[PDB]
Amino acid sequence: DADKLPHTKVTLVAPPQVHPHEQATKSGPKVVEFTMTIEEKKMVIDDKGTTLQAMTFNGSMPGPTLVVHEGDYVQLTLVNPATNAMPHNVDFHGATGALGGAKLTNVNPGEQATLRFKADRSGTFVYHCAPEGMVPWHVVSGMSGTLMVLPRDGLKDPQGKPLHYDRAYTIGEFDLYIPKGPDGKYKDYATLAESYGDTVQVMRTLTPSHIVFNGKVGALTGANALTAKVGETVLLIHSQANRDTRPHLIGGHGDWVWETGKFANPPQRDLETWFIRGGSAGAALYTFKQPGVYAYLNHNLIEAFELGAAGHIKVEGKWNDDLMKQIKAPAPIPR
Amino acid sequence: DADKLPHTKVTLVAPPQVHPHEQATKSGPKVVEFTMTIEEKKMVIDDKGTTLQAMTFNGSMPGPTLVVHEGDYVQLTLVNPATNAMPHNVDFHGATGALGGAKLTNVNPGEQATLRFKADRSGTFVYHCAPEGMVPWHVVSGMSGTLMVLPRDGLKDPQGKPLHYDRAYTIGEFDLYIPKGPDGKYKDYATLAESYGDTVQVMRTLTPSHIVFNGKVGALTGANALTAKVGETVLLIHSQANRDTRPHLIGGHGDWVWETGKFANPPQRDLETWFIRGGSAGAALYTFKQPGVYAYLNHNLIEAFELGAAGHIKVEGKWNDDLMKQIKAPAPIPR
Amino acid sequence: DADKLPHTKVTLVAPPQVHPHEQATKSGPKVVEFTMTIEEKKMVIDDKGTTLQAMTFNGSMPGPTLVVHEGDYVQLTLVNPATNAMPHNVDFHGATGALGGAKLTNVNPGEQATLRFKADRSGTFVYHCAPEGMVPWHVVSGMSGTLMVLPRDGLKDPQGKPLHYDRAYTIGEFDLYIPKGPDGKYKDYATLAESYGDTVQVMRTLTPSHIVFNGKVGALTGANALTAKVGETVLLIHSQANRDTRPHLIGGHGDWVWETGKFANPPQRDLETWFIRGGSAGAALYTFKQPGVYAYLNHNLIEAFELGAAGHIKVEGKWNDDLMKQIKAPAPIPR
Ligand SMILES: [Cu+2]
Ligand SMILES: [Cu+2]
Ligand SMILES: [Cu+2]
Ligand SMILES: [Cu+2]
Ligand SMILES: [Cu+2]
Ligand SMILES: [Cu+2]
Ligand SMILES: [Zn+2]
Ligand SMILES: [Zn+2]
Ligand SMILES: [Zn+2]
């Protein structure tokens, strides 16, 4: 039992990376220790300077991804610094009991707490803040991320054959509800508490003002695009703690996808577009076969291109004419 | 054939309970007789006294759950009392032909009819009212429920091993479209017919004013919370006849879930959040491992906490520190 | 390799039909040649004369369905006539690389191009136009359709047993965003370019004005209903390039359904309602057992009956009292 098991300490990393870890392991169960510190801050979320009175685990939207193996215990120290204004907690969907841990992690500014639970189920699971009476506001303002519980012998296909990834990326998709004033301009609030009432009103319309990957329009574009090479297998972890989304890799596929995010279930293959239910994290593997700049996006194209739910993946390597060839380039229609 | 088979008479019960029944059975096929009586009534749907000009099977939202086994015949007498104002009918998604039965059950006030069909497919299926030219209005006003067709040898896991539940609960989730007047207050209508035009306008926005379990905000909370004990397996039947939803048990899981609701298909395990397509009923099993008060809700948290799509499950038993332990309670951050 | 393979030329047909083809085949891989010509035109989309400044492949919403087999190459000549005003391209979700082909098929009016790709994955896949900076507008205005890549040995059930259809129908479901002027009437635009800004504004609300099958309210009703007979198996291909939908056959089922649309995955059986993710095509088989006029629709009933997402299937044959019988017709309630 957990008091007799070896402990290990994991250092988290900022999205869209994921901290180093093993897939299949010869290691036995451990109590894996993590720490997160809550940061409330105002963030610029689009290219015209709109701000969000935001709330984060570890300073980022999403929070960092935590990786353990089935049968490990997650032991998180949750810190709420006195520089914050609101109480916070955490609800791990991967956990069993006490509202996912929320009941045992209620921290006011200047407080901290330590929760342990058993990661007895494999998969990608959302975690998110959930203070009594303020749940949706904390979630939509940025307080969510992914716990990935890998099977002890790695991922498996529907026939039980081994699957793997060579790199992993974590994408959180955030439906935002930014209020507007009488002039039709987005409101800028001096404090987090001042944004509340107006935000609730926008939330109740069910219409996001912005839907962003990793905290801002274009977060995963340009110098910040995801990268890969031909022949590399990428795992794309996609979390949406509040609202449905439908990920698609343009010019690629989901080779093996667990859209409900639970690795004891067989994956589906060859997907064009998959579905992440609001309140869950899903996972797709894809092995790149062509070089070039791919778009990874929500395939409600309005939500992607107008509202912000789209990123890029820049892939190195040799073009393959067997998979795709320009036979005749654009030219005048023969008369 | 059906004319030669034994008949049986089932007495229905009000949601969220489900009438007594066997799971696996040594019984052969029967014609299972049911009766439902339509009631139009005005209902209070939230905590500030908003009303809905409602339409129900048997007086409740949802209608009662009807349970048979694969190969039985359902024989429903549908009664429309003269005290009602509108014609009604029923469309069983579990049935084959004549618009699910709608074409054969058109009853004006003061009329009744009796439909038989063969329940040749296992699963949870929506039934709902569907009068020509008035279909969405009758559905959104409350006229739906679940037919559960159990396999004759009970539920099975993906390996064909037996699954069971110890108790069953039926949850209907209702997207409501309550109109508002020039003062921004919800309108109160003296008759059902007077609510129609204004409701159609709100429906066409696709934005529910309220999204409730079992007919009202808080229906399944307080003295009306669902109950269980540690070690008990609960079946949660979830119907949504009009709009998608994404059920989640906070602090629990879907141990085995048929989110499309069709028991001949293997279930998925370990789900955090599952998806009920508008126009379907799904089913989840969960075995409680921790005591305490769980929330069962739509994980669009705005739809749950702002609009009403959330209930509670109060669970008796002994806490398990292996699954979850508070290691350090909330306390000042060490300086 | 592709340069050494036999070529074949397919003549496309207008939806809701699908061009003649084999299911299981003894044929080896071919380069299958297709041509499509883009047509921009103004279309009447409802029964009160509302117009859409539309954009189509081959003159129809959806574009025609293209059918090949796994291991074939699709070789499409894309023509953009000088009578069109906008540049166009095509993104095949069934293809690997260069944004699905979009990067290699950018055609201005008066130009054409020829793309080849390998159809290495079985399933129904969306194709759609995707010009840089104009993607959602081209999609929502009508520029999408289905590529069906059949397994070389036909469709298979979860046990690997053979499945087939006797006829196939292709349904595209289009979320439209028609602007309105100060009088609350739908705007009519003299050119395609004039509709742009106003349409973007409506798109950003995420609320369709109309949601139609095959380009108009009632497209698949009356003289244009789909047809079948008792004992015939129909394949219903359903594409939605932008927005989720939830198909349902009223009085029927999805006997075998691939709702993600990818034939290497086992289908689900007995579905009441299935789910097509925005940005995908799905496929259902159903064998008719009762005659009569069925409704095939999106089971958000507001989206179906108010906004237009519903069609009819008129089925010939003999009624079966075993599956369904009117026991007592509507009559006065006994006193
Ligand atoms: Cu918080
Ligand atoms: Cu949650
Ligand atoms: Cu009715
Ligand atoms: Cu229905
Ligand atoms: Cu175009
Ligand atoms: Cu696409
Ligand atoms: Zn690799
Ligand atoms: Zn039990
Ligand atoms: Zn046949």
Numbering used by the authors:
A (entry chain A), B (entry chain A), C (entry chain A): 2 to 336
Mind quoting what the paper says about this structure?
The reduction of nitrite to form NO by nitrite reductase (NiR) is a key step in this process because it is at this point that the loss of terrestrial fixed nitrogen to the atmosphere occurs. Extensive structural studies have shown that each CuNiR monomer contains two copper sites: one type 1 copper (T1Cu) site and one type 2 copper (T2Cu) catalytic site. Numerous crystallographic studies of CuNiRs have shown the catalytic type 2 Cu sites to be located at the interface between adjacent monomers and to typically have a Cu–(His)3–H2O ligation.
Here, we have utilized serial femtosecond rotation crystallography (SF-ROX) using 64 large blue crystals to visualize the resting state of the active site of AxNiR, one of the most well studied CuNiRs. The SRX structure revealed the expected water ligand bound to the catalytic T2Cu centre, while the SF-ROX structure showed an unprecedented dioxygen ligand bound to the T2Cu site in the resting state of the aerobically purified as-isolated enzyme. The density was clearly due to a diatomic molecule that is shifted towards the linking water position from the normal binding position of NO. The modelled O2 species perfectly fits the electron density and its bond distance was refined to 1.24 Å, which is compatible with O2/superoxide (1.2–1.3 Å) but not peroxide (1.4–1.5 Å). The O2 also has full occupancy, which is unusual for ligands bound to the T2Cu site of CuNiR. Since in our experiments the short duration (less than 10 fs) of the X-ray laser pulse precludes X-ray-induced chemistry, the SF-ROX structure obtained from the blue crystals is that of the copper(II) oxidation state. In the present case, our finding of a dioxo species bound to the T2Cu ion suggests that dioxygen reacted with a reduced NiR species at an early stage in isolation of the enzyme and represents a trapped intermediate of the oxidase reaction awaiting the delivery of a second electron to enable turnover to produce H2O2.
